[PDB]
Amino acid sequence: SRSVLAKYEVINQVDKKFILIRCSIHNCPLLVLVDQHACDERIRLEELFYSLLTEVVTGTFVARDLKDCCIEVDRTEADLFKHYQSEFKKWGIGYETIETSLLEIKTLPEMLTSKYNGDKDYLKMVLLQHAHDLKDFKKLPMDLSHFKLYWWKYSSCVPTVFHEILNSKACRSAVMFGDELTRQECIILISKLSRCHNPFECAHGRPSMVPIA
């Protein structure tokens, strides 16, 4: 299924947009144009998801101390945060519920600190978004009673705010259309792309390659 890509040889870059690749023993496999941006975005994303999940699982995830951040919440909203407090700690979001009630956010992870940027209204929405996600069984809690590491086993448990943050970081750092890639740079891209968990889609879910044969 994925082992088909491992049997692909790089030809060269096409229109500074694609990387043309070529495949005896042809059981559903001859020519495929790999989207260079989607290829780099994919490799880059899986590196970012590995970095985040290895950090979170080993308790090495950075949680920068936030000062004077109190957010007004509903009685049920306050109860929803009192419930999943332990869950938000796993992501570096350390807060205390006051008592109408108020959410006293003590700490935040370095990426969320950056994206929030003093917008209490944005931050409230993002935590509520995950609290509701957990509550309505849309997202599972992070089980850390497992004591190598496979980031994709825990990928589904990453809050949407982080997911969004990692997708944009991947896309931004990635190679763009109209960029010059040497045959060697392409060999390397496709070499790493074939070592991905999901090499057939990009960070934003779009297909990373279209066979032409």
Added chain:
Amino acid sequence: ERVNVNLTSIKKLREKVDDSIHRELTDIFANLNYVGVVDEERRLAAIQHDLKLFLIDYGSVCYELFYQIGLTDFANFGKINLSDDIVLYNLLSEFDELNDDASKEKIISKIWDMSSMLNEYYSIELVNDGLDNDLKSVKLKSLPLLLKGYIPSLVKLPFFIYRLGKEVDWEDEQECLDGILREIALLYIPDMVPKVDTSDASLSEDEKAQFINRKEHISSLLEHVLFPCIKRRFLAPRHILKDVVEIANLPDLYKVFERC
């Protein structure tokens, strides 16, 4: 100094070639952007014309190119000199089909009888060392130079000498001169590289390394010596329409993925 060709056959061979030319196919070659080798065995490469990706049989294009160059540059060819000597008598040993010695000597006899013509019209110098009637001591001094920087692979050389006496009919001017140009081009076309199973353990490290070397040499010849020449002087005849296939229309691929 360029030599005058007052031969009726050469002017008739040029008219046939000029009429065969297809403008739409030649417009694809004139503006080609060579991507790379797709199949070393079937002799397939990929080029990009405008926003379209094409699949080219380079063996066919090379056949027609080296046939065209020969017709244009008739009796105005260079010379390729050969410590390591190659004998025509020992070159034909590859064929076990010609079990008889007098049958093997019959081929050499047709070439030496035409040695003066071959060196003056096609720059194929053939010099004997022994007796005037002796056929065992007959070598090949020089081969014509069609493209500067391109040295033809001598793997197909025993077939070239075999087919020059056997296939080429020396009993008609136009058919004989056409036959020799068709034989030189076959020798001049880059060799096929048959596929070998790299993942199979039953093959030695040398077999696997040499196959890679053959693959890398073919791509170098195509990118640096062969395809620039094709983009420059190649005139595509109508029968090559079958050997130039569209595989992708690139604006149809921009639709699948837009700027993130």
